[PDB]
Design a binder for this molecule. Structure first.
Ligand SMILES: O=c1[nH]c(=O)c2ccccc2o1
Ligand SMILES: O=c1[nH]c(=O)c2ccccc2o1
Lengths: 216, 215
């Protein structure tokens, strides 16, 4: 039984969480996902969440005051606070497995050029905080990364249930003049196992040589 | 000017990214994102999209006849066919830049067990196909990865999303003191060469700590 809170200035973007696996997990009561509009914790009439950076630079930085009030209300000392950021530690399969046993995840979605560093620093005095990157590309905000993290974690939760997988096939055995590899039709478990292992090897060498300790 | 077609059995997953697009960019014809339900190309009253894997094992594999029909209708010779898969080549910022100049992306969202490999192999005989992974973790399906790819690519197309080595260091804004923590004084110094050097050192330390692979 897991609780996930997501905090964002675009709560509408997190609605895909209601589809597929995450939606099913919600419907089965294995997780509760709540999405919160950060602007709820603002007090000015313009509901400002960002300001220009100290020391200069392009863009805006999200204000610590608003985030601090939001996290005060949402988090407890048991919370794992997840902050997606291109400058984060890598989020990997190992991370997904680790977080799959947490009682409470809170995901802070940043926009503009990021969140004032003191938000994470202050939070870390009261709870565990993890700044993570889902990959080596830049997004406009943390919302898509939140969806990725939720999907990668939820499919591992006990309630629901290296090298690259090789090609897979299904019916019909011949299509547009392309045949399923005969060994897959042969019913020989030993030979199928070996062919699949080999396929996995070739694909990994080709597409992800780093997984086998080779130069990219 | 870019067209993106997404094919998925969960078309609702993609609707917020469509409502993410600035009216100005659509009216200027710079971008169009369309989402298609894969089941429109199913053959049977049960609208079947997957089937048991040849050679045995768990899960299901998506049907080649269904995907073949869908791509036949949607793709052209100019299309870049993107297939998200945990078994893919890595999708990187370099990839995003490359794809940002394309006229037509089609993103085929499958379950993680996969789409029958003959679909990609057939498509590759008449268009460019890219099987890609957005990171070292497994998702249940390609839809979340589609969202990531669309966002990473379109923010590099001039004026579309509304937005204008080493890791970025910490950032700060007002107030100068908050919950006992002061903004580093150097940032308020008006010595802009020194600020640049300080930021460089912050970047170096953070990269060493979090991403030593980058060095
Ligand atoms: O994991 C990530 N990568 C990003 O690219 C990213 C960008 C802005 C805000 C949050 C983010 O999270
Ligand atoms: O990049 C990815 N990673 C996945 O893990 C993934 C899983 C299923 C389908 C598509 C996918 O794309």
């Amino acid at each position: 039984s897991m609780k996930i809170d997501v905090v964002t200035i675009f709560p509408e973007y997190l609605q895909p969480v209601r589809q597929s696996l995450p939606g099913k997990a919600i419907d089965a009561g294995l997780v509760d996902v709540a999405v919160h509009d950060l602007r709820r914790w603002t007090h000015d009439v313009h509901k400002s969440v960002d300001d220009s950076p100290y020391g200069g630079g392009p863009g805006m930085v999200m204000k610590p005051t608003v985030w601090g009030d939001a996290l005060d209300e949402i988090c407890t000392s048991e919370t794992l606070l997840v902050v997606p950021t291109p400058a984060g530690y890598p989020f990997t399969q190992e991370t997904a497995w680790q977080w799959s046993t947490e009682d409470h995840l809170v995901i802070a979605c940043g926009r503009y050029e990021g969140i004032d560093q003191r938000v994470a620093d202050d939070a870390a005095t009261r709870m565990r905080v993890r700044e993570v990157s889902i990959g080596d590309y830049v997004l406009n905000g943390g919302e898509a990364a939140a969806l990725v993290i939720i999907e990668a974690v939820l499919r591992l939760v006990p309630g629901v249930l290296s090298l690259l997988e090789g090609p897979s096939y299904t019916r019909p055995p011949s299509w547009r003049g392309m045949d399923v590899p005969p060994v897959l039709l042969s019913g020989d478990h030993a030979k199928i196992a070996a062919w699949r292992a080999e396929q996995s090897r070739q694909r990994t060498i080709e597409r992800r040589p780093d997984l086998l300790g080779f130069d990219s």
